[PDB]
Amino acid sequence: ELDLPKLPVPPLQQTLATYLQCMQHLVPEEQFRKSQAIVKRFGAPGGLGETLQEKLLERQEKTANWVSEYWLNDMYLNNRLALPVNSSPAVIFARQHFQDTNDQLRFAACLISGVLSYKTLLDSHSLPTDWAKGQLSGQPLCMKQYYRLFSSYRLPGHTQDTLVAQKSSIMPEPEHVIVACCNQFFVLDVVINFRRLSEGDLFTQLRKIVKMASNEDERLPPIGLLTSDGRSEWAKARTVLLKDSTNRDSLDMIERCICLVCLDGPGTGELSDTHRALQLLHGGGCSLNGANRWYDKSLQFVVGRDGTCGVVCEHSPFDGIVLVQCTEHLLKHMMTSNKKLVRADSVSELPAPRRLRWKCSPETQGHLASSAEKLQRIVKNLDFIVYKFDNYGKTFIKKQKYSPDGFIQVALQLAYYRLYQRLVPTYESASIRRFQEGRVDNIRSATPEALAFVQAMTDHKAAMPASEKLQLLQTAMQAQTEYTVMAITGMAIDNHLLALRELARDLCKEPPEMFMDETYLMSNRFVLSTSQVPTTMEMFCCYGPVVPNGYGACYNPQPEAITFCISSFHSCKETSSVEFAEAVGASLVDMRDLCSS
Question: Which residues are annotated as catalytic?
């Protein structure tokens, strides 16, 4: 904890220089000239920038992580878009085979019991510190994201949401799953009669849940749907629910849970990696499983009657690499046995799981109807493909003495240029977990050296020797590998500029020219938003785009294949997920050809 490094504060002039270098090929020439001037006044001697810097170092000696607050708010809590597709990740597991309902429930039972065994590790401070598993270079990494997997809840606000912590300690006691089935919610207590419940008994329990939920007279309105809407929409709807004590009870149960377990219905008529990911991202909407959810809770594990299984993530408390370590530990548990000796090894009398009740006013009936509609629009708008690139993977790339991540990043840039004949501001997640409280910074992969290389290969190709091209490829990799180190050691720009911008906002008045500049605003409009989410398990992460005219691109690089998860919005008529996915392959194809000259 406290012996971890504190997050650096870059030099003010290195951040300004990097910033202009980043943006010059991404804006018009006059606009840039204007940006040069704004930036020169911003960081001159005696200027605004140096005062703000000074107040940043006030803050960095004062706080464990000087950007925690700012980053949390700017990335997640301030965002008013609904959590489905815009914000919550999903990880999709292999298609399962559930002959009967009990097969489904047997799966859920063994998952829950895996979640309880993982929690216990955490509660015991028995989890190996990363690099004890994962690893970086010689250090240990910050493990604070793991302590937030089950003890968080994200409260919608009218302008700003709140990440609440804890139900984790004195208590003894928060210990219960919420189980959603047929859009109903049931309390599944995991300690009854002062005994933890076995596999067997949680199976027993879930049985009872499916009976009760499938009784059409007792069926309660789909309140989970409310969680799917936009933040300020849900803050208003929640506040009407707050007027009733039954409601309030029921909301508290959900907020204090460990996680949700979603017993989904059978879809659609189905089954591909792509279709199972759409179930995990938004459930299909109103008529399918999209109300069998509660988005403000950090982990919702989906165990679908048809075999679609995975986990939907509320991203505010933790990133993808901790979500994947947690999930792989659960899968590992569900394949282990070979030690877990004998059956419903403990008991019963058990009481049946309680159904959460609700008193839904006319007002709130209206709130459902509009949330239906909004959710329906996100279902129709998302353009998604799971693209499995099987022509090569990591092994190739590393036999070229290149970095898999960097090489993928440059292949993304060429995909984008051979579609659009320009580069655009691009986000790639870089962990800063070497630092206290560290989350991520940004790798801006849309480098001038990537534009140098992609303009050969669409652009007057006729001629132009492949060896020449290869040297441009090498230069762009080197540039990609240098920004990557920069960002994972706290030396890149995004986080710095954010905190200067926030510290401006504060004690020093109306807004500065530096942050009102159209260059600065363009710089944060990530039309390409990317992450590497590698696995060991046979599973993949996805997400939606972060701007209307954007793509989301999540990749799992394996030794002989790369899995790309490409999202876009049908409302923007200039993007197409199949188009871009196809352009990534042909970009990979072309860049291996270049290596073998």
Answer: 315
The rounded distance, in Å, linking the Cα atoms of 157 and 427 is 27
**In the block, which residue shows the tokens 């020219």?**
513
Was 21 annotated as part of a binding site? Answer: no
- Nearest-angstrom CA–CA distance, 226 and 366: 11
Asked if residue 76 lies in contact with residue 89, where contact means CB atoms within 8 angstroms, the answer is no
Just give the CATH number of 1-64+386-597. 3.30.559.10
Domain ranges in the chain are 1-64+386-597, 65-385
The answer to whether the annotation marks 396 as part of a ligand binding site is yes
The C-alpha angle 438, 439, 440, rounded to 5 degrees, equals: 120
Tell me if 404 is assigned to a ligand binding site: yes
Residue with tokens 């063994």: 110
How far is residue 408's CA from residue 427's CA, in Å, rounded to a whole number?
A: 13
Whether domain 65-385 has CATH 3.30.559.70: yes
Q: Other C-beta atoms within 10 Å of 203: how many?
A: 21
CA distances from 445 to 63, 85, 430 (A): 30, 23, 11
Which among 157, 153, 183, 156 is positioned nearest to 165, based on CA atoms?
Answer: 153
The 3-state secondary structure of 353-413, one letter per residue: CEECCCCCCHHHHHHHHHHHHHHHHHHHHEEEEEEEECCCCHHHHHCCCCCHHHHHHHHHH
65-385 matches 1-64+386-597 in CATH topology: yes
Could you give the C-alpha distances from 85 to 162, 213, 288, in angstroms and in order? 20, 27, 16
402: annotated binding-site residue?
yes
* 398 assigned ligand-binding residue: yes
